[model samples]
Target chain A: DQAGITGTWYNQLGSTFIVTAGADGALTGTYESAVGNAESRYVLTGRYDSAPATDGSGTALGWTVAWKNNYRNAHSATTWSGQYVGGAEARINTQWLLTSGTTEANAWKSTLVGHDTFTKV
Target chain B: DQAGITGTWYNQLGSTFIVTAGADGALTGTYESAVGNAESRYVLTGRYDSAPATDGSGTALGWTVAWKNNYRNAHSATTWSGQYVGGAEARINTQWLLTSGTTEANAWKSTLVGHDTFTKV
Candidate 1:
């Protein structure tokens, strides 16, 4: 079963996501941000490693979320790459790179990177 | 379908891997490295992203391989992370980080990083 990665997740930053993993390796979900684009919910799309594990260690997975057009004056897309650990304490260890969206000009650093961990709720 | 990433892949460095993707996100295969490990084959284990896609783009995946203990004075493991693009031109754009193994004493650069593209063959 893909239950290892299919479920509701709450990140360290308080952002929440509801995810579904399909048998064919399709990942679908919705993410609600609690940070930058505070409270905005975005559609989630991504993929996951389909190989079963030999230990409790885990496998790799990644997904992306996009801010709504002009929501907070940007429509940037962010992708998070991570490893999904399954067991009594399932966790998603993630790192994200958010590219500059259309028109949300900040300093020269329009793009950003950060890390977080998600735990089941 | 997971077929986008399941098959034989030839990397720019002449490394070849025969990969299999399970419905549960389990990855297993055999890898033949042409450069570092010469023609020695190693068992492969990793994961993939499993969600249907919206376009020709793709999802994320990562896998790892290890050198046989003492073969080259080490049993270090290397993990490759990348995006898999599907279609007629399926490709794996990858970057790898290899940790120092058991007892290979060389330059201070015990760990290494590099990039390569693996194409279906």
Candidate 2:
């Protein structure tokens, strides 16, 4: 069930994602990587549904995923949301958004959009 | 000597830079802010010269400032290098640079350039 999706995943960008599925059908994980103009690594978190497939076939499970990076000071926070194709529970495809803070000097504003993917590690 | 420049500083973008001058004329500081695509606060470091003005006319001191953000996971790191104008140790005008990691998925590249300023807090 949920155990099938618990493992470490790595992406093409040298970024890593670690996932943990809770007993109550909850999903939580961390995605780490360097981004933008910062020298330090940015660590973001994600959440998803960890429910088992209700149908006898494994292909019936579909879940939504949401992740966020909300710790930057004087900077905008980023977010990601997408659906996990749960046939094998081995991949995640998501889209990202960045929100700028309230100031003209911090040029982080924009409906900056992008896509991301993660696979079993 | 070095005490004139040791204090808390803030920038127009609501970010903060705290400086500490060393005895051997070394300058070290932290620049904290939220940066690109990440939600968490990105804190970077800076280095400069803490030497006293050479001409004794209050305008001979000039120091180079360099800072970096290298902690974001799967993301590229960023850097800043510029000169601090001296007549008053209260303001810092600087330029910034961002470097992308070696991956096609992370779009943090481009000689993406920008300028920044920090004033006494």
Candidate 3:
């Protein structure tokens, strides 16, 4: 089942992620941000809800990236909730959420919610 | 130890590889070749000999890629043998061996060997 999610994927918005799953359903990889410095590859960790299909489809999953360096103080983390879908290069449908690190009430302004469709690259 | 080998790396030759290591020393990733279609990514699997440094340096490892599609008939596989090193982007020093799939006596013409220095990007 781990083989289902082991590979590189990219979204139409130009986000690239390399994920490697373990037999235990644990996932680890890098998230090449489409929103931040495109050159920056942030480390991420996540897990699947269960053993996905051979292609890792139909299973719920989530991964998180803790902002660092420049955003260390201004941002908390960016999380993605999704499941792998089967297709040409396969796909991952995810909802993206960006939260602020600050405790102040600029919550709405600092937070972002969106979704992305990742195609296997 | 796997984390040490987990990430994207570029070589002096403009080759890029994304690696994901496992707790048990197994390795998996994509080899974005420099010699072939730069856009085409070939999948590879391998392992480290021992627990690499916390940074995944100083550990010997190897991986193999079985050529497919276009090279399905003319090529066999490419294997890389090397060890990880520590530095700015850290580095991986490796030598690759390419063999032909055909069973002809032109072994010399069917083989190629070379080395590369990889830097963490």
Candidate 4:
């Protein structure tokens, strides 16, 4: 149960993403912007270390987390995402190549044609 | 699926870790300091999003993650250390080396003095 927050996220290529959290449970959040030729919103529906505590000295305050990626681009198979197991503020940034469906019925279907670095974002 | 805590982990120069966890499960924990040489005490086991929950708006409640490192610092030849599959709160630092003697001794051996990082951590 962490408070919701909004902020901007940037990638190595200088692309900027608007990140936000919903009032819903989960480490719920979304990232938007054009990434690797795929333009769609991404959601992180997992867990996190979002907590509140104060240092005994009443100075430093923060949350350390181990996170994971549950959903990405709302795809069916070969969805490219990750899970953060543990670390201090550790995060991830990966790239994916997308392809739409060839058939009319599935023409709206999107697939991860490829993936880029799964680096510490 | 998570909970059981205690802390302290500084990974860069190698962990002198004692970071605790009990009432174990799939994410049970253990780690040690003597990485390459094999000493003892290191624990950044699994899961970091420890929480209770709150905030209609607090100063800051944080937990952003995309990480995954199941276990390590033990004897799983291929086991080294990692899982910072995200960013912004990204933190991953590691190194390991050791070898023991035995069949007649099983004399404290460690492997993977080989294999390196696959990406940015």
DockQ by candidate, in order: 0.06, 0.03, 0.02, 0.05
Provide the TM-score of chain A alone for each candidate, in the order shown. Answer: 0.85, 0.60, 0.81, 0.34
**What is the Cα-based lDDT of residue A84 in candidate 3?**
59
Poorest 10 consecutive residues of model 1 chain A by lDDT? A99-108
TM-score of 2: 0.38
Cα lDDT tens digits, model 2, B39-111, are 4334444445545356543312223222334544525445656555545455667655555444553463333
TM-score of chain B of each: 0.84, 0.60, 0.81, 0.22
lDDT tens digits, residue span B10-109, model 3? 9887877888977754567777777652346655665554332243225555565544333322233455555565555666766655543222234225
In candidate 4, how many Å is residue A113 off? 4.4
Q: Write the residue-wise lDDT of candidate 3 on A35-110 in tens digits.
A: 6633466556655533322422244455655443333222234556555545455666666555432222332253
Ranking by lDDT: 1, 3, 2, 4
In angstroms, how far off is A97's CA in candidate 1? 0.5
| lDDT score, candidate 4, position A77 | 12
Ranking by DockQ: 1, 4, 2, 3
Q: B48-119 in candidate 4: lDDT tens per residue?
A: 222211211101011111111233222221122222222334233222222221121232231123222222
Model 2 stretches with alpha carbons more than 4 Å out: A1-121, B38-44, B52-74, B86-89, B104-110
Fraction of native Cα-Cα interface contacts (under 8 Å, chains A and B) also present in model 2 = 0.00
Whole-model Cα lDDT per candidate? 0.60, 0.52, 0.56, 0.27
Candidate 3 displacement at residue B22 in angstroms: 0.2
